[PDB]
Amino acid sequence: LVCNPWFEHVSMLVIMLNCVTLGMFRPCEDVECGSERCNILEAFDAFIFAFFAVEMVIKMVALGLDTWNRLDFFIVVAGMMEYSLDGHNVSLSAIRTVRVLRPLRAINRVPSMRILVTLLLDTLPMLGNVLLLCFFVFFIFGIVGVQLWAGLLRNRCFLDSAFVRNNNLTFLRPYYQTEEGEENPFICSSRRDNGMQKCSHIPGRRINWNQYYNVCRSGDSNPHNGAINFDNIGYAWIAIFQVITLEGWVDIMYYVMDAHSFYNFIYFILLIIVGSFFMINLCLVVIATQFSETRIVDSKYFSRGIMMAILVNTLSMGVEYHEQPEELTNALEISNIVFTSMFALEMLLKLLACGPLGYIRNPYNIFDGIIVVISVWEIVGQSVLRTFRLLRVLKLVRFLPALRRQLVVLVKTMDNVATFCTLLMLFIFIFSILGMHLFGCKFSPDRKNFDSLLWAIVTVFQILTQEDWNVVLYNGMASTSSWAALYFVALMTFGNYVLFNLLVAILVEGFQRFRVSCQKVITHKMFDHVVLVFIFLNCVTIALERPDIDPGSTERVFLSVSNYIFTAIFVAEMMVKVVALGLLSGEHAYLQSSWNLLDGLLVLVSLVDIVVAMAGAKILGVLRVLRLLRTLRPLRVISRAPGLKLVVETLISSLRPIGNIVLICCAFFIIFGILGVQLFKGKFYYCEGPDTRNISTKAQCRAAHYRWVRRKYNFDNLGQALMSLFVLSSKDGWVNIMYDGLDAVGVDQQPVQNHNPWMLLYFISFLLIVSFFVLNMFVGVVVENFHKCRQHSPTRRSIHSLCTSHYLDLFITFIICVNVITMSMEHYNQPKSLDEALKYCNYVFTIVFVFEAALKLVAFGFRRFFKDRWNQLDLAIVLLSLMGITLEEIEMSAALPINPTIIRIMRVLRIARVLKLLKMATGMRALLDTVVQALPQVGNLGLLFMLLFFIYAALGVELFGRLECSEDNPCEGLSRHATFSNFGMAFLTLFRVSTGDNWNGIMKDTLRECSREDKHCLSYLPALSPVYFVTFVLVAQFVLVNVVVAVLMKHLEES
Template sequence: MAPLLQIGLLVLFAIVIFAIIGLEFYSGALHKTCYSLEDLDEIVTEGEMETPCHTDNASLAPPGAYFCNSSIATCLELWMGPNYGITSFDNIGFAMLTVFQCITQEGWTSILYWTNDALGSSYNFLYFVPLIVLGSFFMLNLVLGVLSGEFAKERERVENRQEFLKLRRQQQLERELNGYVEWICKAEEVILAEERTTDEEKAHIMEARRRAAAKRKKLKHLGKSKSTDTEDEENEAEDEDGFSRASYLKNKVKKQGACQNFWKAEKRLRFGIRRTVKQQWFYWFVIILVFLNTACVAAEHYNQPKYLTDFLYYAEFIFLGLFISEMLIKMYALGPRMYFESSFNRFDCVVISGSIFEVVWSAFKSGSFGLSVLRALRLLRIFKVTKYWSSLRNLVISLLSSMRSIISLLFLLFLFILIFALLGMQLFGGSFNFPEETPLANFNTFSIALLTVFQILTGEDWNEVMYQGIASQGGTKSGMIYSLYFIILVIFGNYTLLNVFLAIAVDNLANAQELTAAEEEQEEEDKESQHLPDPESLIPLQKQQAEHEKELEALQNNTDGPPKVEICPPSPGGESKMNSKRDADKEDKDAENQEDDMGGPKPMLPYSSMFILSPTNPIRRAAHWVVNLRYFDFFIMIVISLSSIALASEDPVREDSEWNEILNYFDYAFTGVFAIEMILKVIDLGVIFHPGSYLRDFWNIMDSVVVICAAVSFCFDMMGSTTGQNLSTIKSLRVLRVLRPLKTIKRVPKLKSVFDCVVNSLKNVFNILIVYILFQFIFAVIAVQLFNGKFFYCSDESVHTKDECQGEFFVFNGYERPPDVKPRQWKQQSFHYDNVMAAMLTLFAVQTGEGWPQVLQNSMAATYEDHGPQPQVAVEMSIFYIVYFIVFPFFFVNIFVALIIITFQEQGEAELQDGELDKNQKSCIDFAIQAKPLERYMPKDRVSFKYKIWRIVVSTPFEYFIMLLIVLNTLLLMMKYYQAIPLYLDILGYLNNVFTVFFLLECILKLIAYGCRNFFKDPWNTFDFITVIGSIIDALVVEFGENFINVGFLRLFRAARLIKLLRQGYTIRILLWTFVQSFKALPYVCLLIAMLFFIYAIIGMQMCYRGSLAEYYVVVHQG
């Protein structure tokens, strides 16, 4: 708990810093809005919500600011602010709450747009972007790192404790057993020594000893060979069970001689069926049946034709009969005991029993009793294929092994939700009834309170529930204290408990990766041991190799004259043919890496290019010389940059503009340059048929595809505009040219490691992606079964059926305006479950966490097909979403993140795999090499004035005094609030000047004690000096100038020195060091992210600009 507490202090410190900055710049900025000139109490809105404004005059408004229409409205500072006045920077409490909301990434874009409307968008992003990057992306993720480390330590501690207890118990049993055995042996020796013991008794004693030893050996063997609940258990026990049963039947047949032939035939039939059941074709036949049954279940959709309904109805009975037959056949062949030993068989029996109960129930009563969803679970039988897929098997085993920890965590999570739901009912029960409406997320009933807490736990719209909770308790005047309930719920629920899921995933996936790597290494060793030749057969080869080495040494000694440069490397000889293909590929890759690392020219390939140009052809040699010029790649990079700028400068709205025509000519030139580059490389390297050719490199394939697509697009454009309209996607493929700078990755080791980690993580994610898609499909099928055709509604809320949703209805716009007449329309929700594809898309949107409460409310309001919604009529349907959230966002998504984390860790270890040092040793050596010794300055003359000042500056009381001044100055900066009286603000200003004088004296004393040169060697002193100069300039501008510029934020950096107060703790120093070290890899990651953003932005410009907007919706901030 101590590390988490220290992380909490670090996050709190960051929140305070950003809250002070927000208080300085945004205090009172969100209280202006547009009021009607006819009625100053009426707010004029554009859209559904009020918008902050800057001024009435468009000429005075800064870029990006919102100004009112001066003909109908005026901008007045009378508004309480957005979200009941809670979202503001009016005082330090509101500012800290707003900053915390931004850090959680929920609703922060609305605050960004509101501040843009109020103050302009020129420099506003300089506050919010660092806030999100530092606060959300870095500091809150430190919680994950600490939780993961603490979880691993705790698991290791528990495992060590269990191992110790097991070993101690085993030693106790061995001591007790040895005591008993020793006592029995002594008794047997006494018995054997007695003369009265007969030979027959001695033989019985020796036989008992032999049987006891055999029994111990058998028990030991069974203990070692115990495996998981799969079909292997059936194979292990098959012979023993069969022979024991056969001997039993044999004895029975002897007693009943008349039935001997029948029992023999029955035994042969059962053994034959058992062999058939265990055949490979029978296994795949059942898997195909499962797929066909799932396809039939997935084919169901809304408004399907009657023949498909009838077909699916009868097909379900056929599949049910086949699966019942399979179950009975396996149960007869294996026997009930062996059948139920397999977990898959038990699962099949439960699903089939549920299907039988569903059929029986539907025969007597309409409805499927909700058991029809079990049909989709049959697809889980596909996991039997893990018997032949080792990596997937290890992944599934690791997931199953984590179930114990996850179940414990789910129980703790349930208790957490239960406690906060009951507490929420005590605080907010019955108070969420507003005049407009009662929010769907409330605490009025226990079930809805549980769902509301769960929604807050997922982080979606938690701020909206908080706003409503504060408003229900008196608003900003008396309800702000209730925000602590929501803050504590988010911190301990979302950022602590839910991150434990990721910690469990990282820990268990690491074990799965290690197990897979160990199995692959063992398989590789087995293959090598199988293919190794006899030692005697290697003697002639060793002699021949020794003779070759002697001849080569003699040739090297007899060579005269300067060395000659080879045009191409020699062709592989006999020795290389003896090597395996894997070693040859490894050597080729190493050679390529060496060539890339060397800045020199690359040798020409020894193969004929396109079967025409030999290595000595002058055209090919000229192309090779051009491609390998020192500035060729630099020139291509410049062309790529210019091409990217041209793509970003296109006007997608006015395609026929003169600017686009100019850019089109430049596009022709850029494409020509890229085509010439491709032709030169093809001439130099060849096309594809030999190693090292052009199309055997990924980057070259990408270049060729881009050039060909651009050329095809140009051809269609020249043929006619109507022909090229349908090829906008081909034109958008030209933006892939921005990927060409990725070729520089090989030149930058750290950027290459980041890119390799991304690629390797995509490879490793394949297995979990299969499991993910399988479960996603199962949930989609279940959703179709539950909500098919139930997500429709009428535009007139008073109508609840499709047949009644006809005609027209009145829409009231207030008491003073006449109502509008609109036609009734039977509409469908944007996200629905009418078919499997739409269901998978809806579930994917739910999984991302954005807007899922609305989908939940639509599901709970669903009634019947072609019937409208009734709010919260089926609260039990929320169980589906709770289970889905536990399986996907809480578990599977965290597994994806865990795979990326493990990939990054393995990538760092793989780079040191061939070396003698491990990762920690190399890090220590690098730190020792790069670390600089701490220099402390002291004047030589101990009787000088400078030495006395130095003694004062370096003393502990002086440092504590400066720390006290920093804390007091920070508290002073936090005391500002909106609409404060002028006298109070003047007092704060004078006190700020006093602190500025104190910090100025500190700088002067340190300058006298250290001297200018030594003073500026310390970055902290440089930072203090800049802060003091900025504070002095700010004070002079405010006091004597016209306040045309605000540089007061410079003195806010003084609060950053609070970090010195946290240096007392060892763990917090490690966290700060980790936080700083993470910035070293940030530029390379940001470069890849910036390229991705640029590519998708260009694609969005090319493809999505034609989207028409609805009449009632006005896009103000996005586009």
């Protein structure tokens, strides 16, 4: 019965059987219960539920009245309620949802998966301090957002009520709305605010009605069908949660810039730095620590010959492109015969040298054998076997022992990855079925839907990658209820929590006479500081450069003259230093260090700039190239600052241990790049027009007077293919590229939605394998840092007792906790009765703090009281509260000498009372301290991060400073808020790129061609653009990775 294993096997078979019937659910067809197919599935489910009742009875009879035994009881109890309730028509379909819990029974039946889930549950309790820090972020930023932006995103530009009445015409739509509709709302700034968008910015007609929408006031709805707004604490948290995931966080920022003020970017930069970066990556650090506490053939020349032969063949497959000349097609097949024959000869010699059994004694010889016969099989049989010619690159692991030793190490990582993958697949399956029950057949259809198991799993998988997950959220909220956000919050939270534990699991198994004067000047203590000032001033000159400076303006004269002065100063600095040390004859000479070589090259480039500028000659092309190099002069700051020099050299040394993983990742990119060209070259064209459903070929597109155009990210050649793979790896806009590959039909054929669903294997396989390499690169850097780190008064006394006793602290805690509750009750258009109730509460809390300060004064004495910082903090809030109450009362009276701005700020500043809880949070203070001790390392990396932005911010203005956007030449990523028109706007844009929010959209806008009519084009910008974004993304991520490692190491040694 119970003391034998086969009874558990039978239980596992029935549990697996339920997984099949749950996946067979059809949300559109089964909910009506009409089909015979349905009738037998409910019959199967009743059969399965009957067994589960029998199992529970037997195990009950055997044992008498363990989390996992409770769990089976909960599932049986809930199932019986649903099973027996059949008969009452009220909410029966909603109660059917409890069935999605049943696959959880597999956890306890599978031993290895049972142990893993035990470790997760034992590690969760300790995350209380991280959770406490999370509440502080959501409450502080939640209340601040509501008091600032409540009801503003309902603003629209309306017609004047007097205008519509006196003119006796009502055919006009009441408020301005774009031709697209309410999905693109024109949010306007009210007269009592200073937002970026006014009703005077409405375009004219394209018979002048648009100019009569001249009053800005509240409408009925907020953006995205009411999903995005700050009308209450509830909607504020949904907006904050989306920002913390760094998905569509700029669209939220643009709304409040249009409606309220430009300087709202401060709110989102602080929320992203504190909330997204530190508060999420402290979750990893905490788990990381806790989980740790818990005669011719054998010749060298012959081997080298075959080595280069394989390499040349592998690379020749990369010269394919869309419109090949047929003589190039024939050349590649001639080249195939030569190399195929060469490997065939190689096998023949080795078979004669060792005999067949001797040849089979080596596995790599067996592998090479299978490829040769498959290659010969293709030639004799003259598109299937062509793809398998990519396997020839695998022969190089024989001749690369260094890479061979890395591959086996990665393989040894995958024996524990398997355990986590099983738990994730069960995790994804449960949410995939849940989504079908909640949202099935209700997103009427969108590609991102839960109408079937295949696209339910893909949608759930997509949400975990956090790509357009906000688009699915708005569908869920609008279709069912605003409380549908908890589905996505739980999915992302638990999904990422489980993924951190995989990263930690790998880490822990990883740990297991004039010359005399010059020499004196160069050795002066103040030489570096004196030169650092000129470098700083030169940076200011670069920041002021922008395209809109008129050539004849005084600013141009100031900037041009400054260039000559700085050029002379740094020529003199170099000269004096070269005289002191010598150029390259001495051992201390100038060019004996790379930091001196860099300065030399910059000075040379500067001199060439003077020479070219002196030319009245056909040197326009060369001039623009030198302008780009002038943006690299700020790099001289690194060598003058010892702090930056150490960090910069540290990052370079950190690439050594992960050198082989990068090479394997690069080889993977090319193998998939070549494969993508073979699959999709020439098929990413499409017809662009208003009525296109009737078009099916290029010829019909031409006939319809439309235009035949190509996607920006495509696979027409290996150069285009690599750019597409990078966008997939970064997982920004990767879903759109996947649709193009799923809809590909052929050359000169219109793509058809979901034409080839089997192409999901190509795109999903690349994301998974690439993520596995990037996961092992982060581990490699951590393991290296760890290995190197470990190698390196009768009436007064009674009051004093009360103040000394803990009773006062608990009373203080209760009052502020109640205050936080009253601060969350504010909301747009709240009733006047609530206004009176809240202001009365403010009276009570202020009096309590005033007494709290008095008693503390009486107990401890003035100066001894004031010594403690916490006591100083109390006095500030008490003082802060008094001025806020005073301003409020006087303004509410008849006199009005105060600005409504000062009242707003004082009202917002009362959120500072939350800091009085921080004293009780001893655990959280220790966690925050862990970051405070890591500033000397994290601080220097921050300087490098800002220096990275400065060079690319200045470079961006030079490259993309003149790119326009218009209805004639539309742009997908750039807008009125994201531009490189000046250094200030370029800095803000790079922060968006750094977070990765739709950075791929900005690159598109630079890949699109120049107009035939317009001037100032750079015909080779589409070639420079990928290099700019690719290098920035990699360097930016690498720098931020080391910041996490710096904090991670300190916590381990500190603990």
